[PDB]
Design a protein around this ligand. Structure first.
Ligand SMILES: [Cl-]
Ligand SMILES: [Cl-]
Ligand code: NA
Ligand code: NA
Length: 129
């Protein structure tokens, strides 16, 4: 599923991400835009052989099991394919674990490079929330 901007904002709000660990909703929407272009089916392979999955591009070296990343942890205890669903619940629940691990949203390279320090409230402007 490819989400609309306000549709995703509403879904993330219902799943408890607004101000989760102090990150306002616009941060999560901005990160999803530049990680996946709001496409739940996005996958990208990394140089080390791991792969990133879903709307928030969660990596198989640490967070999910894809059966082909040797020596990986499955810290979210989920198959990586569950992260590609039109239902974002599994991606959101895993992202909450990631953002709590010490480095905040700096775990998402595109957030650090394209969202951090910008007017992220613009990503939810105009949405009925
Ligand atoms: Cl915001
Ligand atoms: Cl980047
Ligand atoms: Na929308
Ligand atoms: Na893994």
């Amino acid at each position: 599923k490819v989400f609309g901007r306000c549709e995703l904002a509403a879904a993330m709000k219902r799943h408890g991400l607004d101000n989760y660990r102090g990150y306002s909703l616009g941060n999560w929407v901005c990160a999803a835009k530049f990680e996946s272009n709001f496409n739940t089916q996005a996958t990208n392979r990394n140089t080390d052989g791991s792969t990133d999955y879903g709307i928030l591009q969660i990596n198989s070296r640490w967070w999910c099991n894809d059966g082909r990343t040797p020596g990986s942890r499955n810290l979210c205890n989920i198959p990586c394919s569950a992260l590609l669903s039109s239902d974002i619940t599994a991606s959101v629940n895993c992202a909450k674990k990631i953002v709590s691990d010490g480095n905040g949203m700096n775990a998402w390279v595109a957030w650090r490079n394209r969202c951090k320090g910008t007017d992220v409230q613009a990503w939810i402007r105009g949405c009925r929330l």
